[PDB]
Design a protein around this motif. Structure first.
Motif, mmCIF file in Angstrom:
data_model
loop_
_atom_site.group_PDB
_atom_site.id
_atom_site.type_symbol
_atom_site.label_atom_id
_atom_site.label_comp_id
_atom_site.label_asym_id
_atom_site.label_seq_id
_atom_site.Cartn_x
_atom_site.Cartn_y
_atom_site.Cartn_z
ATOM 1 N N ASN B 17 9.864 12.343 38.986
ATOM 2 C CA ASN B 17 8.646 11.897 39.642
ATOM 3 C C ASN B 17 7.591 13.000 39.609
ATOM 4 O OD1 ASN B 17 7.042 10.031 40.895
ATOM 5 N ND2 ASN B 17 7.969 10.251 42.927
ATOM 6 N N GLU B 18 6.364 12.632 39.981
ATOM 7 C CA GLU B 18 5.274 13.602 39.995
ATOM 8 C C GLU B 18 5.538 14.716 41.000
ATOM 9 O OE1 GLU B 18 2.780 13.956 42.540
ATOM 10 O OE2 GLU B 18 3.690 12.509 43.916
ATOM 11 N N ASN B 19 6.126 14.378 42.151
ATOM 12 C CA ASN B 19 6.443 15.401 43.140
ATOM 13 C C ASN B 19 7.598 16.279 42.676
ATOM 14 O OD1 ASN B 19 4.522 15.234 45.173
ATOM 15 N ND2 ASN B 19 5.576 13.559 46.231
ATOM 16 N N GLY B 20 8.403 15.787 41.739
ATOM 17 C CA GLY B 20 9.485 16.579 41.191
ATOM 18 C C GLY B 20 10.857 15.973 41.393
ATOM 19 N N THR B 21 10.943 14.941 42.225
ATOM 20 C CA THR B 21 12.218 14.299 42.495
ATOM 21 C C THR B 21 12.593 13.347 41.360
ATOM 22 O OG1 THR B 21 13.474 13.033 44.130
ATOM 23 C CG2 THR B 21 11.182 12.396 43.754
ATOM 24 N N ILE B 22 13.878 13.014 41.298
ATOM 25 C CA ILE B 22 14.393 12.078 40.307
ATOM 26 C C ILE B 22 14.333 10.680 40.906
ATOM 27 C CG2 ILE B 22 16.491 11.261 39.203
ATOM 28 C CD1 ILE B 22 17.186 14.065 38.478
ATOM 29 N N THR B 23 13.625 9.774 40.230
ATOM 30 C CA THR B 23 13.417 8.428 40.741
ATOM 31 C C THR B 23 14.187 7.354 39.987
ATOM 32 O OG1 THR B 23 11.733 6.746 41.216
ATOM 33 C CG2 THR B 23 11.373 8.171 39.307
ATOM 34 N N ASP B 24 14.622 7.624 38.759
ATOM 35 C CA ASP B 24 15.371 6.646 37.983
ATOM 36 C C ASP B 24 16.141 7.368 36.889
ATOM 37 O OD1 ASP B 24 14.379 3.208 37.377
ATOM 38 O OD2 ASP B 24 16.340 4.168 37.147
ATOM 39 N N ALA B 25 17.311 6.835 36.547
ATOM 40 C CA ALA B 25 18.141 7.378 35.484
ATOM 41 C C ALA B 25 18.771 6.238 34.699
ATOM 42 C CB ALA B 25 19.233 8.303 36.033
ATOM 43 N N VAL B 26 19.124 6.523 33.447
ATOM 44 C CA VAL B 26 19.704 5.535 32.544
ATOM 45 C C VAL B 26 20.907 6.161 31.853
ATOM 46 C CG1 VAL B 26 19.370 4.236 30.425
ATOM 47 C CG2 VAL B 26 17.622 4.188 32.180
ATOM 48 N N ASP B 27 22.067 5.521 31.981
ATOM 49 C CA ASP B 27 23.237 5.932 31.221
ATOM 50 C C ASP B 27 23.003 5.670 29.739
ATOM 51 O OD1 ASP B 27 25.720 6.878 30.580
ATOM 52 O OD2 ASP B 27 26.824 5.532 31.913
ATOM 53 N N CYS B 28 23.638 6.474 28.891
ATOM 54 C CA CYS B 28 23.309 6.478 27.474
ATOM 55 C C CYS B 28 24.367 5.825 26.597
ATOM 56 C CB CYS B 28 23.061 7.913 26.999
ATOM 57 S SG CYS B 28 22.077 8.024 25.501
ATOM 58 N N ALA B 29 25.538 5.501 27.138
ATOM 59 C CA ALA B 29 26.589 4.828 26.382
ATOM 60 C C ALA B 29 27.187 3.696 27.206
ATOM 61 C CB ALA B 29 27.669 5.811 25.940
ATOM 62 N N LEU B 30 26.323 2.965 27.907
ATOM 63 C CA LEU B 30 26.731 1.822 28.711
ATOM 64 C C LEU B 30 26.498 0.504 27.985
ATOM 65 C CD1 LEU B 30 27.547 0.799 31.711
ATOM 66 C CD2 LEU B 30 25.075 0.480 31.950
ATOM 67 N N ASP B 31 25.314 0.318 27.406
ATOM 68 C CA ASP B 31 24.943 -0.936 26.756
ATOM 69 C C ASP B 31 24.133 -0.607 25.509
ATOM 70 O OD1 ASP B 31 26.176 -3.034 28.024
ATOM 71 O OD2 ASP B 31 24.590 -3.303 29.520
ATOM 72 N N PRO B 32 24.034 -1.536 24.551
ATOM 73 C CA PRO B 32 23.155 -1.310 23.396
ATOM 74 C C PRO B 32 21.712 -1.072 23.811
ATOM 75 C CG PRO B 32 24.665 -3.086 22.930
ATOM 76 C CD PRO B 32 24.864 -2.740 24.380
ATOM 77 N N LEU B 33 21.280 -1.742 24.881
ATOM 78 C CA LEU B 33 19.955 -1.477 25.431
ATOM 79 C C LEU B 33 19.836 -0.034 25.897
ATOM 80 C CD1 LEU B 33 17.328 -2.757 25.725
ATOM 81 C CD2 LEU B 33 18.022 -3.793 27.890
ATOM 82 N N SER B 34 20.912 0.512 26.466
ATOM 83 C CA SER B 34 20.900 1.906 26.888
ATOM 84 C C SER B 34 20.725 2.843 25.701
ATOM 85 C CB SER B 34 22.183 2.225 27.647
ATOM 86 O OG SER B 34 22.310 1.400 28.791
ATOM 87 N N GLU B 35 21.428 2.574 24.598
ATOM 88 C CA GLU B 35 21.257 3.391 23.400
ATOM 89 C C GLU B 35 19.848 3.256 22.841
ATOM 90 O OE1 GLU B 35 24.800 3.259 20.555
ATOM 91 O OE2 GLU B 35 25.433 1.887 22.149
#
Ligand SMILES: *[C@@H]1O[C@H](CO)[C@@H](O)[C@H](O)[C@H]1NC(C)=O
Ligand SMILES: *[C@@H]1O[C@H](CO)[C@@H](O)[C@H](O)[C@H]1NC(C)=O
Lengths: 49, 86, 24
Positions: B17-35
């Motif tokens: 986020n702009e303030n520096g906090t983490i607001t969202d994350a995505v796993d990278c080997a969960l779904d083809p959409l993730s890749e």
């Protein structure tokens, strides 16, 4: 570089910051513990007319 | 009542986020959409087709072959001989 | 008993400040 009073706020556990490709844009001094921002001093080319 | 999970060596894409906090994350080997999101390095994908990785069939076992016969060698008549010299 | 951990288990991997940056 040239140091300036940074406006962005650090969480109590970081030490510095960067934006893209390890470009250190911020740092905190080890003594006063104040958050400072780092930007390079001006440079450019020279042309003759 | 408490929950216990486990950690594995995965890869994650984090949106700071702009303030520096983490607001969202995505796993990278969960779904083809993730890749697709990982390869595009973005949290949103538009219509189309994207190449994400490569598929390779790995070898199963190994085989070694050599001439059919083995030329046999006189150790049988050198060791098991009738008489030796002095 | 079993349960599905929806999206929990994410932390700060380093001690480096970042802002408006998508980092892998
Ligand atoms: C270091 O010491 C000075 C005075 O000796 C003090 O003002 C300052 O807050 C100290 N900083 C740290 C990080 O201990
Ligand atoms: C960032 O922090 C400031 C100060 O607490 C707050 O006013 C602002 O709404 C925050 N921004 C976001 C996007 O949360």
């Amino acid at each position: 570089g040239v140091l300036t009073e940074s406006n962005k706020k650090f969480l109590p556990f970081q030490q510095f910051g960067r934006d893209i490709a390890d470009t250190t844009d911020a740092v905190r001094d080890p003594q006063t513990l104040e958050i400072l921002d780092i930007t390079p001093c001006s440079f450019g080319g020279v042309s003759v007319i | 009542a408490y929950y216990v999970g486990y950690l594995q060596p995965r890869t994650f894409l984090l949106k700071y986020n702009e303030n520096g906090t983490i607001t969202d994350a995505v796993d990278c080997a969960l779904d083809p959409l993730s890749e697709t999101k990982c390869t595009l390095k973005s949290f949103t994908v538009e219509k189309g087709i994207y190449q994400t990785s490569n598929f390779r069939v790995q070898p199963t076992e190994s085989i070694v072959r050599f001439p059919n016969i083995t030329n046999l060698c006189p150790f049988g008549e050198v060791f098991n001989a009738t008489r030796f010299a002095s | 008993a079993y349960t599905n951990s929806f999206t929990r288990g994410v932390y700060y991997p380093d001690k480096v400040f970042r802002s408006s940056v998508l980092h892998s």
